Amino acid sequence: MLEAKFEEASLFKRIIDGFKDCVQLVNFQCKEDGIIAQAVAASRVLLVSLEIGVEAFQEYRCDHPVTLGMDLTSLSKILRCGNNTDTLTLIADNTPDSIILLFEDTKKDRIAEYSLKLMDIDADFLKIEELQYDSTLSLPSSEFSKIVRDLSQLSDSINIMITKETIKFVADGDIGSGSVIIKPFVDMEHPETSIKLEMDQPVDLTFGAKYLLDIIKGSSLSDRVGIRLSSEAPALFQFDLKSGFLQFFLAPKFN
Amino acid sequence: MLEAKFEEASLFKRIIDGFKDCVQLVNFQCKEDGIIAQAVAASRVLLVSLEIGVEAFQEYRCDHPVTLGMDLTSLSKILRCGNNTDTLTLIADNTPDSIILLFEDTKKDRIAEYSLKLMDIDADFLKIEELQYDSTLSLPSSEFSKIVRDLSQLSDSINIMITKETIKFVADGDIGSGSVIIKPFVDMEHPETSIKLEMDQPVDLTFGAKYLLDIIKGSSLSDRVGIRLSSEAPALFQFDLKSGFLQFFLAPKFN
Amino acid sequence: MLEAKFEEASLFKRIIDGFKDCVQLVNFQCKEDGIIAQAVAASRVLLVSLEIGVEAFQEYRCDHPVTLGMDLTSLSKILRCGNNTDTLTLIADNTPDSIILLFEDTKKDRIAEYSLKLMDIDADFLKIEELQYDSTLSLPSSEFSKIVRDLSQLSDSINIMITKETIKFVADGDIGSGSVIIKPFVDMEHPETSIKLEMDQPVDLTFGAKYLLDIIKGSSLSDRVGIRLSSEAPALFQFDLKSGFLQFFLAPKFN
């Protein structure tokens, strides 16, 4: 018996909008220490990993573990409901068929109570992260977003390219070509406009722009995006939450 | 010879936007005491009844009765014209072929004068309202609108259900299910957020959500919606105007 | 070797948005005294003539003349890039294959550098303007825009009609008919709301509304539109820039 009460219903809506456009189904493992989730694109080139810790809820109680599969399209239809600053309460009784989402507003009158049917997904859950990534940068999520969006208009493939104190995004298509170079710097008038970079080995990797575009939708959810690149593994783009995170693992393009 | 001068052109535009999306044609009976109108959906499950009394015009003069039929799509194209705070003047000469709509703005320069061709509709006009309805509730039109819109995503049919001091809206579909319960209360910090209910007999009726969705567009036009339900007749949803009203009669779904 | 530096990148974007929707290709002649351009609709009923003088650039240097053809769809994709208040720098080396567009923002970090491939257009450039036009009016570009947009809903053809101190726009279709009359006046509380008219001969001409609609998009670019009509030639609609202009030559409809 689960009873997890988001402070503002807008968060859960947002974390789900954050990543709904790239994957159709999703398995939510609810535990004593919060809910965690994973979603693999059907293409198997993008994985979405989510963690919501207890400190992201106004209240939270999971007596036993529960796994809730659910169609993201359905769940987010239900999440357009209610008002934006209401208490959304996830509820499930043990070994369930239905999760129910229970919205109540700053007065006690509208008791809006939806209930979603659960899909059945098998928990081949993936641990795809690495100890050490060839490079690690970190920049404003809005910035990463303009440069992705901008370059996606030129071809299907954006090429990230990292060399000592130099992070370079590039697209190359029929129209023409595009090239956004950026460099690390601690700015102090807003220590959050900054750009961090740690390089152990230079990288040069290419990515589907389709997917980069899906990934940057997570900017609604943190001011900063951390992206970790490696030749040996999928790249990891990560948006930190209050308690928790939203990760996107993304595989590079071949030749 | 008709010469009816709306104060703000935005009103007539709005009362027509209020109900244009559900019915294609419309017969406007213009009389000494104002204009009244009726429109039946082709499906014959929704009737739209309008009254605009003299106190909704800055000026008004109908020498003899006139009936003006007109295609709502055409009329509302003409009503996108001019500016939003202009004097819109309906004009017709007796036994006419064309209504003309005459827009003029807060300076005397733009004389914008459109003219619409009249369709020919036969006046099988309907008196479908009842003396006593099983129940009568009354709530904020914006509220009724969110709860309609919210539930319409779950199935094609929303089910209203009224029992002593309890008004309950419900939808039930494949996704899952939804249930918004609401209760009467005189609030006094804004006596207009309130919720009134008068029940003589409990009701339980189902409605096309298509149509509920068309109906709530009338919320642009009054802060409050009054809805009157009966087993023996179509339900009546009503938005009050300054002088007049916009009614929707709506028939329930069968089995 | 060209190096032309718009103050705000938004201008070049805007002058191109101003007229991109009517013509697909465009030949930009760059010279010591600025850049000038011409674009003919494939229908050969609309010509677009542009002049950007040196005083529209923060810096400008054209060593030798250069002609740059370019697909407007491609160029404006590139012009959605960067931020709205950045320095956009047109660059070309002599006898080039590629123009490059170089965006930099109010801090020196994002060096965003796109490059467009040039099409090959033959410079059959047109001098289609007249010494004396039957009439010359001049009005607020936003006004000309509402009256165009408004009337276009009634038919495919708007008819301008000028007679001593009387400028009259009219549309006539199946729906009905529309008629916006306007008259000259020096207003002084804003000498820019005014309406000027000079008539040498009355005119009566008809125009594709398609095209009038494309033309009025130039209102983003000047508060005033000047339109010059003649029976013997295409009408000239003109939006003045800081240093330069955007003209539309438009041919009348036959019978």
CSV table of C-alpha atoms in Angstrom, one decimal, chain A residues 74-78 80-83 107 109-117, chain B residues 143 146-147 150-151 153-154 173-182 185 187:
chain,number,residue,atom,x,y,z
A,74,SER,CA,-2.5,7.5,-20.7
A,75,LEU,CA,-0.8,8.6,-17.5
A,76,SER,CA,-0.1,12.1,-18.8
A,77,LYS,CA,-3.7,12.5,-20.0
A,78,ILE,CA,-4.6,11.9,-16.4
A,80,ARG,CA,-3.4,17.3,-17.5
A,81,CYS,CA,-6.3,17.0,-15.0
A,82,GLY,CA,-6.8,19.0,-11.9
A,83,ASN,CA,-5.2,22.3,-11.3
A,107,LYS,CA,-9.8,24.3,-0.5
A,109,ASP,CA,-14.3,20.7,-2.2
A,110,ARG,CA,-13.1,19.4,-5.6
A,111,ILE,CA,-12.0,15.8,-4.7
A,112,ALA,CA,-10.9,14.7,-8.2
A,113,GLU,CA,-9.9,11.0,-8.2
A,114,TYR,CA,-8.6,9.3,-11.3
A,115,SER,CA,-7.5,5.8,-11.7
A,116,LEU,CA,-5.2,4.3,-14.3
A,117,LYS,CA,-5.0,0.7,-15.4
B,143,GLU,CA,-15.1,25.1,-12.9
B,146,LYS,CA,-12.3,22.2,-16.2
B,147,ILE,CA,-14.2,19.3,-14.9
B,150,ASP,CA,-10.6,16.9,-17.8
B,151,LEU,CA,-13.0,14.0,-17.9
B,153,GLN,CA,-10.0,12.5,-22.1
B,154,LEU,CA,-11.1,9.2,-20.5
B,173,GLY,CA,-12.9,4.4,-20.5
B,174,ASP,CA,-10.0,2.2,-21.6
B,175,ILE,CA,-7.2,4.3,-20.2
B,176,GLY,CA,-8.9,4.2,-16.8
B,177,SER,CA,-11.6,6.2,-15.0
B,178,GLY,CA,-12.2,9.6,-13.5
B,179,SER,CA,-14.4,11.0,-10.8
B,180,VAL,CA,-15.0,14.6,-9.8
B,181,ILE,CA,-17.3,15.0,-6.8
B,182,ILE,CA,-18.5,18.4,-5.7
B,185,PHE,CA,-21.6,25.7,0.0
B,187,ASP,CA,-18.8,30.9,0.4
